[PDB]
UniProtKB/Swiss-Prot annotation, chains A, B:
Domain of life the protein comes from: Eukaryota
Signal peptide: none
EC id: 2.3.3.1
InterPro entries linked: Citrate_synth-like_lrg_a-sub, Citrate_synth-like_sm_a-sub, Citrate_synthase, Citrate_synthase_AS, Citrate_synthase_euk, Citrate_synthase_sf
Residues forming the catalytic site: H272, H318, D373
One biological process term in Gene Ontology: tricarboxylic acid cycle
SUPFAM superfamilies named among the record's database cross-references: Citrate synthase
Any Pfam family the entry gives: Citrate_synt
Quaternary structure and interacting proteins, as annotated: Homodimer.
Main location: mitochondrion
Keywords: Mitochondrion, Transferase, Tricarboxylic acid cycle
Name listed for the protein in its UniProt record: Citrate synthase, mitochondrial
Similarity annotation: Belongs to the citrate synthase family.
Biological source species: Gallus gallus
Length: 435, 435
């Protein structure tokens, strides 16, 4: 009775028509200007893509189809006896723009359990990888290796009419989301619980729950942490590295597997998703240098040393946000309720009072406030997941949700190849006169 | 005596200063405007990146550091007794902006031979991949898997000051370029010459030549074809999918291996580099449907069928070019001189007279002229490399040259995170009023 595919089939045509007419009336309307500095500056401040699933406000933070995080916490279906929103429902909301019912949500859950299966070549590959190969690298390679199963790649090669692309993107999106956790978990076990198995998927549990079982975690609060984690890391508008990467690559008709794997390569950058891991490594050195209960003056000292050494303070600053990230806050709130006395937490808490000030003092960062990465590993560490090099993988798993949600839309709406014009410094100097 | 690293060390500071002052004077100068339609249209027509290595003219075609293809053919060092430009020299030109000497060129050649070596984990991986896994997929996975050797990743993790990034990017760029051919060739042999070995690198040959030997080709004209192939496919300004992908991903500090592998995922799209393979598959069906010597009326018919079926005619059209691609011409010229009587060539030739007209007639394509992909496989087929699914790999190998050339520059000049602002249809309608 529930079928997202049928829902989308009705939704698509209405949106097509709506954009059609809009463009008819305003396609030539200018929404902005490009300056030299924006070009030199990684397009900062440039309105350059259409991304439907979420929109980030520099002051207010992210909105998913119009709903802020608190709204989601409050409207999205939760697990039986749960408090955290199920990621399944977030997906539904991104995809349809509507809040789902719990019945709808459980359908996603069954769908994802039904579709989870790995081909032997991928299993073999993971099991043969060396332990010194980074988790994100093993993840990306494995997703790329899964493209032999692409339904989209196969229909394209069969000559499918372009109007049906979305249909195949949809299938691969659902299959990929379903497989992610098994891939991710196999890496965790091969690297950290060598000789053990991830086991089987229980068609009866939610996605997060099957994930945590494959990861080998029993604590129920952990399961709750996971549901939240996976929901809040899902999407962050379209201009962020990982999302933009998936967009750009999918724009050339590369299948979802390939687009996703490229995005992961983007997420693995220190200035992007890798910050989650970097925050923890930074804290570890901290506590190692100074030792567990530091003084504010010593924290300042340690911050300055990093800055003076031509390095960044991980988990602070943002390309678009201008205030403290609601994702950070949302994590703080969870810590306060569940592990208020953790020393690491306490350390993170203390940094909140110091870091922004130092940054302000330094005078370079546009946004001195923390971002989501400043607070995530601390929560994970608490429950026993101390492998910091694996943290980004979790972020990867979550991000699939948003990026793949949009991906279907991009193909449904017929977005073309992303191909902007480049310029050389010399060509640009000429264009103007030069300086 | 020759050391590109030392040359760059002198070059870098001058460029820094030059951009500095320019920006001082014109950073706020507007170079363009953004309209609704550009946003909806994959940034078509938007000046959005700074890319130093090459600049594409919509009428004239690509210029590499100011030199057109004919100029390169004419100025770049050639092999002993050769006629085709060595890719090594093209690299030097991209990187320094200066035409190299043959002595310089031979240094690149030795450097690339010295640095070529694959780690066992990567070898193992390739050898375990299934035959149904696409060549581009095996390539991308393998490059990602090589990041365990990244010098840049390692120095970043050690806390290197940001001013030294280029130095490590440089090393990885050279190591990666050196390894590409071995990777590429191992895939070719595992897939198509099962049981044989790629052999060893001869520190005495040029890069293209060691490549063709590992591929198992003896014809000297083939070697010449390769040198040309690899030179002309090298770079195509910064807004193309693969280049932009590498740029965006490297912008987050992901290492060159990861940035390159993501670019490859971009290249593997049907609307991008995969067209080379698609052209051949299209021709094969053609000749199969119609049979070897077709009539113009039947060629038209066949073109129309494709178009009417919601498909693209591979190898025709371009996002920026408005006239026939000089890369196409350059290939035609080679065919005319070396395999003028090939039936396939002849077919390609015949299409040149028909395709653009049909396209013009259809009224959709902005550019009805052929692009580089319309002419490449035909040349390869002639020499015995009939595995069409492998063609994109060659394009991949070549592209490393341009993208990695720029990559060093991006980090030398301190380009920041690429992060434009996205918008939703609803947010945009509001911004205006809506249509
Ligand atoms: C996220 C970030 C790359 C945004 O960059 P951008 O919009 O260019 O930042 P900006 O305009 O404030 O930069 C102004 C100056 O302040 C510097 N600065 C910014 N954030 C800084 C930080 N956390 N520590 C030190 N210096 C910093 C920045 O590097 C720049 O210096 P240069 O002039 O020499 O280029 C940046 O604030 C940063 O480097 N953060 C540290 C890494 C991090 O936390 N990454 C995870 C981000 C998270 F949202 C995610 N998962 O994507
Ligand atoms: C390269 C290309 C994606 C540029 O796209 P774009 O700048 O959006 O093209 P455009 O502005 O002319 O498109 C106008 C219309 O003509 C259509 N059209 C363009 N080229 C076409 C072709 N070769 N066959 C059929 N229809 C085509 C295009 O799809 C579009 O239709 P919609 O309105 O329904 O979107 C495009 O011309 C194309 O689809 N080419 C066929 C694939 C190909 O040859 N790829 C290799 C390109 C090569 F340069 C490379 N290696 O990257
Ligand atoms: O929005 C961005 O630029 C980075 C970020 O926080 C994310 O991708 O979650
Ligand atoms: O320039 C582009 O958009 C595509 C192209 O021909 C290339 O990347 O070689």
């Amino acid at each position: 009775s529930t079928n997202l595919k049928d829902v989308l089939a009705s939704l698509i045509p209405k949106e097509q028509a709506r954009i059609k007419t809009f463009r008819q009336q305003h396609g030539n309307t200018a929404v902005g200007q490009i300056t030299v500095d924006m070009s030199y500056g990684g397009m900062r401040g440039m309105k350059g893509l259409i991304y439907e699933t979420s929109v980030l406000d520099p002051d207010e933070g992210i909105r998913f189809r119009g709903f802020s995080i608190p709204e989601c916490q409050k409207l999205l279906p939760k697990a039986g006896g749960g408090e955290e929103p199920l990621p399944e429902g977030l997906f539904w909301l991104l995809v349809t723009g509507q809040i789902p019912t719990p019945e709808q949500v459980s359908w996603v859950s069954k769908e994802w359990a039904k579709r989870a299966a790995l081909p032997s070549h991928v299993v073999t590959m993971l099991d043969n990888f060396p332990t010194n190969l980074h988790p994100m690298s093993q993840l990306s390679a494995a997703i790329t290796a899964l493209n032999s199963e692409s339904n989209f790649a196969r229909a394209y090669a069969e000559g499918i009419n372009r109007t049906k692309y979305w249909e195949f993107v949809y299938e691969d999106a659902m299959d990929l989301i379903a497989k992610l956790p098994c891939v991710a978990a196999k890496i965790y076990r091969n690297l950290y619980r060598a000789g053990s198995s991830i086991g089987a998927i229980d068609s009866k549990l939610d996605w997060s729950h099957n994930f945590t079982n494959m990861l080998g975690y029993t604590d129920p609060q952990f399961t709750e942490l996971m549901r939240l984690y996976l929901t809040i890391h899902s999407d962050h508008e379209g201009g962020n590295v990982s999302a933009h990467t998936s967009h750009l690559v999918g724009s050339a008709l590369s299948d979802p597997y390939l687009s996703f794997a490229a995005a992961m390569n983007g997420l693995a950058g220190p200035l992007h998703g890798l910050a989650n891991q970097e925050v923890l490594l930074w804290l570890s050195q901290l506590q190692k240098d100074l030792g567990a209960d530091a003084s504010d003056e010593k924290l300042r000292d340690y911050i300055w040393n990093t800055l003076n050494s031509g390095r960044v303070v991980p988990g602070y600053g943002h390309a678009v946000l201008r205030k403290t990230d609601p994702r950070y806050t949302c994590q703080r709130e969870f810590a306060l309720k569940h592990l208020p006395s953790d020393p690491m937490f306490k350390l993170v808490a203390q940094l909140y009072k110091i870091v922004p000030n130092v940054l302000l003092e330094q005078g370079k960062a546009k946004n001195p406030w923390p971002n989501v990465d400043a607070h995530s590993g601390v929560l994970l560490q608490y429950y026993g997941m101390t492998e910091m090099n694996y943290y980004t993988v979790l972020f990867g798993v979550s991000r699939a949700l948003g990026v793949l949600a949009q991906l279907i839309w991009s193909r449904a709406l017929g977005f073309p190849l992303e191909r902007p014009k480049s310029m050389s410094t010399a060509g640009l100097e000429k264009l103007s006169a030069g300086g």
